[PDB]
């Protein structure tokens, strides 16, 4: 519940930044709006790629850290760790 709320507020901020920044280039706006025009499943799929070190997702470090801590807690509760 709170992870998704923070992610949605981030999307609010990032979309506004892209709208403010659309005026430099129309070609740039295409790759910036890939996310906002992707289906809702694809949007969250690309937002949840900060696992591993490829790290091309637009998620910020703090939001990444929240899930990277909850996931470690879940693993140590499942006994995998």
């Amino acid at each position: 519940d709170d992870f998704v709320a923070k992610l949605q507020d981030n999307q609010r901020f990032r979309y506004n930044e892209v709208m403010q920044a659309l005026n430099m280039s129309a070609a740039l706006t295409a790759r910036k709006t890939k996310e906002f025009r992707s289906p809702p499943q694809e949007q969250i799929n690309m937002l949840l790629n900060f696992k591993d070190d490829k790290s091309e997702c637009p998620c910020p470090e703090e939001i990444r850290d929240q899930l990277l801590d909850f996931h470690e807690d879940l693993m140590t509760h499942c006994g995998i760790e």
């Binding site: 519940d1 998704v4 949605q8 999307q11 609010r12 979309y15 129309a26 809702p40 499943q41 969250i44």
Partner: protein, 67 residues
């Protein structure tokens, strides 16, 4: 082009719908991809004769759990 750029993002969606989407995405991306190796250790534990002479076998050697 503004209308084309205008679509259905996550920030407009109700929170519970996005939570369900997050549950599915988290599942597939993290829980499915998580890997831990235990097969060799498990088989080694299962193949051990578990203190059979200490146990009161009093006959033929009892088959191990893997058997």
């Amino acid at each position: 082009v503004v209308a084309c750029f205008r679509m259905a993002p996550l920030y407009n969606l109700p929170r519970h719908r996005a939570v369900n989407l997050f549950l599915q995405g988290y599942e597939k991306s993290w829980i499915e991809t998580e890997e831990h190796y235990f097969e060799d250790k498990l088989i080694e534990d299962l193949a051990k004769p578990g203190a059979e002479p200490p146990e009161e076998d009093e006959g033929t050697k009892r088959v191990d759990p893997l058997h």
